[PDB]
Amino acid sequence: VRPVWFPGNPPPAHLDGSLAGDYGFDPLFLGQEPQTLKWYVQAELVHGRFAMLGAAGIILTSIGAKVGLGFPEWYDAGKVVVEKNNIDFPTLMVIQFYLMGWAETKRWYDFKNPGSQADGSFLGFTEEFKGLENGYPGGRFFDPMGLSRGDAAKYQEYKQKEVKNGRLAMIACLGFAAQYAATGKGPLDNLADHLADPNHVNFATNGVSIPI
Amino acid sequence: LPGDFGFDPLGLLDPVNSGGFIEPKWLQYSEVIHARWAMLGAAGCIAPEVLGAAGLIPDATNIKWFESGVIPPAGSYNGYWADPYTIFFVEIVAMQFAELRRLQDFRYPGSMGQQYFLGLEAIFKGSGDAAYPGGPFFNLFNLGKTEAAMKELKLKEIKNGRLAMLAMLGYGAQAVMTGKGPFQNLVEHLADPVNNNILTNF
Amino acid sequence: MKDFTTYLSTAPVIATIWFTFTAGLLIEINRYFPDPLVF
Amino acid sequence: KVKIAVDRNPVETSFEKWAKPGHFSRTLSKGPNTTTWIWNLHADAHDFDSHTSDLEEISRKVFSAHFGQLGIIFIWLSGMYFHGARFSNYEAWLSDPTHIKPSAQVVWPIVGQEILNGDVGGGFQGIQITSGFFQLWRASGITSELQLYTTAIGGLVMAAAMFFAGWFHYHKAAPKLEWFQNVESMLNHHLGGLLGLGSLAWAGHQIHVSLPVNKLLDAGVDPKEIPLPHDLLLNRAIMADLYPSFAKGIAPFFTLNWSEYSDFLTFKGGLNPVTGGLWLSDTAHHHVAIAVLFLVAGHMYRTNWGIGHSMKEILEAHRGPFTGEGHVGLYEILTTSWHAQLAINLALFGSLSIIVAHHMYAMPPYPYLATDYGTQLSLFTHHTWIGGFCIVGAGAHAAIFMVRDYDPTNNYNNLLDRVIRHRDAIISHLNWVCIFLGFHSFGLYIHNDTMSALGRPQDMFSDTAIQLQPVFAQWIQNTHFLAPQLTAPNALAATSLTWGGDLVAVGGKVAMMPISLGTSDFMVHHIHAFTIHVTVLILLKGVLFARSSRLIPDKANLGFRFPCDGPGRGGTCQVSAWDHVFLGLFWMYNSLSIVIFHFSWKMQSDVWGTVTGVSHITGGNFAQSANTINGWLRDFLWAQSSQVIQSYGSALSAYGLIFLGAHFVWAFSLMFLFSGRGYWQELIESIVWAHNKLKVAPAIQPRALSITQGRAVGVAHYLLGGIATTWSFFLARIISVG
Ligand SMILES: CC1=C(C/C=C(\C)CCC[C@H](C)CCC[C@H](C)CCCC(C)C)C(=O)c2ccccc2C1=O
Numbered sequence A: 001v002r003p004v005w006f007p008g009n010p011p012p013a014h015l016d017g018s019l020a021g022d023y024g025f026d027p028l029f030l031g032q033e034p035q036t037l038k039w040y041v042q043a044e045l046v047h048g049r050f051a052m053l054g055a056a057g058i059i060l061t062s063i064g065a066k067v068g069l070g071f072p073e074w075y076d077a078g079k080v081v082v083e084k085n086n087i088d089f090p091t092l093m094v095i096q097f098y099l100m101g102w103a104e105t106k107r108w109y110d111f112k113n114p115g116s117q118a119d120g121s122f123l124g125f126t127e128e129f130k131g132l133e134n135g136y137p138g139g140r141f142f143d144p145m146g147l148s149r150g151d152a153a154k155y156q157e158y159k160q161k162e163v164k165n166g167r168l169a170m171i172a173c174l175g176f177a178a179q180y181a182a183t184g185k186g187p188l189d190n191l192a193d194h195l196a197d198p199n200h201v202n203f204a205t206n207g208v209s210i211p212i
Numbered sequence B: 001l002p003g004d005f006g007f008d009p010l011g012l013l014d015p016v017n018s019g020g021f022i023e024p025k026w027l028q029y030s031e032v033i034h035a036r037w038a039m040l041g042a043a044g045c046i047a048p049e050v051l052g053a054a055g056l057i058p059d060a061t062n063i064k065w066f067e068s069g070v071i072p073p074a075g076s077y078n079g080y081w082a083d084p085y086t087i088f089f090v091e092i093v094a095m096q097f098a099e100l101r102r103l104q105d106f107r108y109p110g111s112m113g114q115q116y117f118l119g120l121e122a123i124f125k126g127s128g129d130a131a132y133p134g135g136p137f138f139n140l141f142n143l144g145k146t147e148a149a150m151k152e153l154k155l156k157e158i159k160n161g162r163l164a165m166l167a168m169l170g171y172g173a174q175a176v177m178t179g180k181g182p183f184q185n186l187v188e189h190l191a192d193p194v195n196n197n198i199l200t201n202f
Numbered sequence C: 001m002k003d004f005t006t007y008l009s010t011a012p013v014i015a016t017i018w019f020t021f022t023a024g025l026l027i028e029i030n031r032y033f034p035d036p037l038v039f
Numbered sequence D: 001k002v003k004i005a006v007d008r009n010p011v012e013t014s015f016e017k018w019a020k021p022g023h024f025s026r027t028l029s030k031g032p033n034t035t036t037w038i039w040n041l042h043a044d045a046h047d048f049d050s051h052t053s054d055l056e057e058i059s060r061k062v063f064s065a066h067f068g069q070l071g072i073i074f075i076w077l078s079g080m081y082f083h084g085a086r087f088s089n090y091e092a093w094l095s096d097p098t099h100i101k102p103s104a105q106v107v108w109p110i111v112g113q114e115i116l117n118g119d120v121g122g123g124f125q126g127i128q129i130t131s132g133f134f135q136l137w138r139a140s141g142i143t144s145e146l147q148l149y150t151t152a153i154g155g156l157v158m159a160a161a162m163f164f165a166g167w168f169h170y171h172k173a174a175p176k177l178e179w180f181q182n183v184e185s186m187l188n189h190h191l192g193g194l195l196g197l198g199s200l201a202w203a204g205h206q207i208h209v210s211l212p213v214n215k216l217l218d219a220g221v222d223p224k225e226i227p228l229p230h231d232l233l234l235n236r237a238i239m240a241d242l243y244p245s246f247a248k249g250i251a252p253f254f255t256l257n258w259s260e261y262s263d264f265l266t267f268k269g270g271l272n273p274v275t276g277g278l279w280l281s282d283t284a285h286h287h288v289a290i291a292v293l294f295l296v297a298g299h300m301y302r303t304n305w306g307i308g309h310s311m312k313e314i315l316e317a318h319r320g321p322f323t324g325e326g327h328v329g330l331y332e333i334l335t336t337s338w339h340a341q342l343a344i345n346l347a348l349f350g351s352l353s354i355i356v357a358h359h360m361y362a363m364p365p366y367p368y369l370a371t372d373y374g375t376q377l378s379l380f381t382h383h384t385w386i387g388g389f390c391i392v393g394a395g396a397h398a399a400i401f402m403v404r405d406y407d408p409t410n411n412y413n414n415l416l417d418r419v420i421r422h423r424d425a426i427i428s429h430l431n432w433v434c435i436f437l438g439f440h441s442f443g444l445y446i447h448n449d450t451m452s453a454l455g456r457p458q459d460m461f462s463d464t465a466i467q468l469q470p471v472f473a474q475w476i477q478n479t480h481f482l483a484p485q486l487t488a489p490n491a492l493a494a495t496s497l498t499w500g501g502d503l504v505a506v507g508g509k510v511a512m513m514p515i516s517l518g519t520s521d522f523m524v525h526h527i528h529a530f531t532i533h534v535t536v537l538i539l540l541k542g543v544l545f546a547r548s549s550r551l552i553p554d555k556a557n558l559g560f561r562f563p564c565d566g567p568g569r570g571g572t573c574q575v576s577a578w579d580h581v582f583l584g585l586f587w588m589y590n591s592l593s594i595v596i597f598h599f600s601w602k603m604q605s606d607v608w609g610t611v612t613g614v615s616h617i618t619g620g621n622f623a624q625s626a627n628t629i630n631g632w633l634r635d636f637l638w639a640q641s642s643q644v645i646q647s648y649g650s651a652l653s654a655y656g657l658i659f660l661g662a663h664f665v666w667a668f669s670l671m672f673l674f675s676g677r678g679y680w681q682e683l684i685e686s687i688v689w690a691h692n693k694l695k696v697a698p699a700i701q702p703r704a705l706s707i708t709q710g711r712a713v714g715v716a717h718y719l720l721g722g723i724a725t726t727w728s729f730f731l732a733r734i735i736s737v738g
């Protein structure tokens, strides 16, 4: 009864509806086993969140670029700023890897042992380093605004909208990637051009998308 | 069932030990689909020729049908408010939708008026029979008043559709051999029933 | 699907995989460190 | 009454039994406990007759297996075409064929294997191919590598379609037995549709594409200059210019004035002097002839109207006084067993590939083909080897059927039965005729070598001393040379420059010349015939002693394959028809080796060379060094081994390396072909003591190979070594000296 991505075909076995965005879409049966399925759930969540980040950053920098504010284009900002300031590739990379490794291995051993992270083995902390769901570590910090502890219906709706916008952001970031690698240009600029003439400023005329 | 003459000299409608695509249901379904297509295609292939012969349309249009762009080597036309490919694309998406949902109907009967579709489901309920769902749109006027008249109409449809398939093949063969237009061939064979013929075209 | 995974974990497939890994490693090594003989 | 019948969803699509090894045999599916389990699992994966006993089941299985084979072939073809498109000097060779050498396989600049990137011309480097795809494609009319590219893409798509068709017609809508049994419909369909329409569409493609563009290429116009096939199709004006018949369309053909179309439907005979190929108009006329012939043939048998014949009725109608019941029941045996069909078809197939090799070196059909002597040699010997193998397989599966699915009741007084009766007289006769030929033919050579090394060449057997002349062959050659004057008055030349005549050369290189026949060739032909009869004897015993024997009267129940019957009654090693096929394969290898040696030496010595007259590569030492064995060894072998044994530091180092490797593995086979599994198992046991003492004995018990397994591994290794050695030698030598 749930809207099935392929209207007319029934969902497979493991795809049920308990999770957010269960449009019955796993035509490759990649989620029969519940271990692997919870696993790919956490994977999809983190990826959607990263994509939401990336889209926001790219679009804001691109606006700042079109407007006369000197902001570079995203695929160059890195080199341009690292050469601007007195930064070292090695030191930046190593500090980044340090901190990310710490936080991420903590999340990992939490997924392994679902409770052993708020065990006070930290500084003194507990009731915050303890998970709430598989990939939903809302405590006093990861949900400091405290919506997870109120109006479970509204909370479910928020999980739904979160995963929806996450999938959209993933698709849009890949959009950006192709836009740039094809038009050798700025994304917002390609946008303005297709605005100028949708009939002719489009992939049908980009002469690469359609290789004819 | 409609339009049979007992004529199946090759005998494929045999309903026993059937399977795959060879099954009278799907087969006659394909026949009626082709009939409706060929009807539309014949009407189109002809229309602009005579329409410009009567001169009611600007001579800018009314080029011969095989030149409108489908085969650029056969000659292309231009002036369309967009590119052939830019049109081809939206054509892809629209036909994808229509054909796919018709197929989902035929494969899981009645199951294509259920998923929320902007209220555009009650019409897609139709009959339990492909090629004849009827419903408010697909039978706009309540046609088939007498069921005798209904069978009569189905018969007439299959008749005209087979005629149309024949006519479309005729257009193809003439336009390849004599290279002219269809109405061109007509005007000629009219001018000379004897000296405007495939015998003359040898 | 689990049937398929076990089919993968069958022996000849795993042998092929491990050998492919070893060979690819050796090849990349001889690429980046051509003709070593000492140390 | 014939129609279409099918059954739905016979077997699902799941990995369940994919996780169940050996599911097809209830025996093996119960698990492994010893090594030989794995051998058996691999061995009988495809033994469908031992899997189950449903004709329809085995039938659906072999159908989908056919589809798999087809898909594989399409894959490999697309691979060839894509390699030719992307990594070749093909367009350079199109510009100049006569000095640019085909090269498509390129190596990677790594630890040192880059030295093989031979400078083949065209500013290109790599490895010379011998397949001849270049000349083939030029013959067809491929100019743009874009064409090779799209061709490869289409081939891949076709392979995918084949695999899908296999899956479908096995798992979703499987046919039925009678629909597999509608043999008259099958023959009508094949002979008419397949071959008739193949030759027809072939003639069409030749005419409308490959004739004009090749006329232009031979006219010498720039390659890329030549217009495009679709332009050739569209503009009748261009084709009218090329051949003034094209202006008239088809009306003259319709009016039965076929003579006017003779402009490009020719009957020249002979060759094309600019390319050394045959006349493309002539081949087009040929293919038209074949097309109509086979399409008319496809209208023979009755299927759903009384018109047409009944194979079984025709079969029974032919009975003889000396023969009893004659051909009765054969329609049954053939309509019932796969193995009879497989035997017959393999036999014909092998013979046909042999004929292909011969005809093709005889009358080279492609442009610039005769030039690459390497390509000629390679194609010839490859197709010959394949023919030999197919024929031996025919024999094998014949005997297999005879053991397994024959029935005595149905055939009381049969041709088959009476043959089984007088098998003894037959085999004895064949024995004697063989040993006679062996004696005479080989003793001649030994007598020659003795008369030489003794110091009395006066009494040898050559063209100089006491002579032997292939009078019959010379006579036939004479007659085929003089034929067109009277026999085929509308033939403008002999169909082969070998019948006699002038010499056609291109690019300073000979393309053909009348071929001499000497006492040497007489003796070589007779050695050929002897070894052939011997192989035939081996296989005929292998089949006629299938069910039983005057030694073993119960051979049948013991199966087709088994080691022995114990040392009983004096030792019974090697008594199975499987072992018959074993040894037959041995002697087949010997014969084919000798025949390709004959071919190579004759070509190199007395046809090949360059025009100045001609300069034969060995100047003609053959007709005097090929009738003594010492002369053979030294002057031919030990001679021509030069380039292959000095091919180092060059792009030919690989050939020498493979020469060595092949000698090695060929010798290695002998341990297997000589040892005995009991010793192996004992040593295995001592090894198990060793391991186990450390508590590292394997859970899978170690068992030495089965007796037949030892035999088979030995033969495979030996054959591999021998054929690889000769292959490497041939390639290196001819590429060096040509
Ligand atoms: C040498 C020899 C053996 C001994 C050879 C044997 C048993 C074959 C050994 C095969 C390999 C080398 C061992 C098993 C390999 C498997 C892939 C297991 C994994 C091994 C790892 C190293 C990968 C026989 O058993 C035999 C039997 C009958 C006639 C002649 C002979 C014969 O000549």
Ligand code: SF4
Binding pocket: D563, D564, D565, D566, D567, D571, D572, D573, D574, D707
């Ligand atoms: S093991 Fe060998 S020698 Fe012993 S009986 Fe069997 S075949 Fe004969």
